[PDB]
Amino acid sequence: RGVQMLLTTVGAFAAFSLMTIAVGTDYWLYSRGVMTHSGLWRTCCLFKGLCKQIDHFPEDTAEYFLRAVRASSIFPILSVILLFMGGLCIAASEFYKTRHNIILSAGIFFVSAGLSNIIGIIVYISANAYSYGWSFYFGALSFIIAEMVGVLAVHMFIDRHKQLRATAR
Amino acid sequence: FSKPFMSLGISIMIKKPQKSKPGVFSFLDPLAYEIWMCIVFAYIGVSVVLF
């Protein structure tokens, strides 16, 4: 009962922590004119040690729209804020669960936040056009943990719904 | 001079490439080595949507 809820809570916490680490640094790696890492905000070379914001958006209208989406990381930041809101909703629904319908909306918002994070990962991969960083793999692992946590959350929701349907009859 | 016993000319010397065809690494050639991971991620995401 509560063990699966605690597992879902620590999975959401670990996914939020890995998303924070993906926001932080070392998201990608690019050999400049020597390798250099980047975390979608600034770049740091491997002189060696100097760091600066290399996320310069200038140097069809769909190319300018894609550049505006890739600039400032509009998708994954709002995705992480939506994951924080879903985690706050799950924490508010864990204690004193009066209404048995907020968990479904919280899980739906959590799955939509995961889909938006996958869309932001697709944007960050499309804007790259050599190696990769470890925080990209950490964000992918957080996406996998978020998918499994959403599966476990909707499984607990349909179990609680079946329990309510059995007790209501 | 006597008559030439062995005639010769000018040819071209190249690096003589061999059949350097690897195995599994030649399979994931034609698209990328990174689009497939996004394909698997969208696959498991759509399975999450269906479930």
Swiss-Prot record, chain A:
It comes from the Eukaryota. GO terms for cellular component: AMPA glutamate receptor complex; cell surface; cerebellar mossy fiber; glutamatergic synapse; hippocampal mossy fiber to CA3 synapse; postsynaptic density membrane; Schaffer collateral - CA1 synapse; somatodendritic compartment. It is found in: Membrane; Synapse, Synaptosome. Its main location: membrane. One of its GO terms (molecular function) is channel regulator activity. Keywords: Calcium, Calcium channel, Calcium transport, Glycoprotein, Ion channel, Ion transport, Membrane, Phosphoprotein, Synapse, Synaptosome, Transmembrane, Transmembrane helix, Transport, Voltage-gated channel. One of its GO terms (biological process) is nervous system process. It is a multi-pass membrane protein. The chain crosses the membrane at residues 5-25, 72-92, 102-122, 138-158. Belongs to the PMP-22/EMP/MP20 family. CACNG subfamily. The L-type calcium channel is composed of five subunits: alpha-1, alpha-2/delta, beta and gamma. Interacts with the PDZ domains of DLG4/PSD-95 and DLG1/SAP97. May interact with GOPC. Acts as an auxiliary subunit for AMPA-selective glutamate receptors (AMPARs). Found in a complex with GRIA1, GRIA2, GRIA3, GRIA4, CNIH2, CNIH3, CACNG3, CACNG4, CACNG5, CACNG7 and CACNG8. Interacts with GRIA1 and GRIA2. Interacts with MPP2. Regulates the trafficking and gating properties of AMPA-selective glutamate receptors (AMPARs). Promotes their targeting to the cell membrane and synapses and modulates their gating properties by slowing their rates of activation, deactivation and desensitization. Does not show subunit-specific AMPA receptor regulation and regulates all AMPAR subunits. Thought to stabilize the calcium channel in an inactivated (closed) state. This is Voltage-dependent calcium channel gamma-2 subunit. It comes from Rattus norvegicus. The gene is Cacng2. The chain holds residues 6 to 213 of 323 of the full protein.
From Swiss-Prot, chain B:
Palmitoylated. Depalmitoylated by CPT1C and upon L-glutamate stimulation. The chain crosses the membrane at residues 33-51. It is found in: Cell membrane; Endoplasmic reticulum membrane; Postsynaptic cell membrane; Postsynaptic density membrane. It comes from the Eukaryota. Detected in cerebellum (at protein level). Belongs to the glutamate-gated ion channel (TC 1.A.10.1) family. GRIA1 subfamily. The postsynaptic actions of L-glutamate are mediated by a variety of receptors that are named according to their selective agonists. This receptor binds AMPA (quisqualate) > L-glutamate > kainate. Ionotropic glutamate receptor that functions as a ligand-gated cation channel, gated by L-glutamate and glutamatergic agonists such as alpha-amino-3-hydroxy-5-methyl-4-isoxazolepropionic acid (AMPA), quisqualic acid, and kainic acid. L-glutamate acts as an excitatory neurotransmitter at many synapses in the central nervous system. This is Glutamate receptor 1. It comes from Rattus norvegicus. The gene is Gria1.
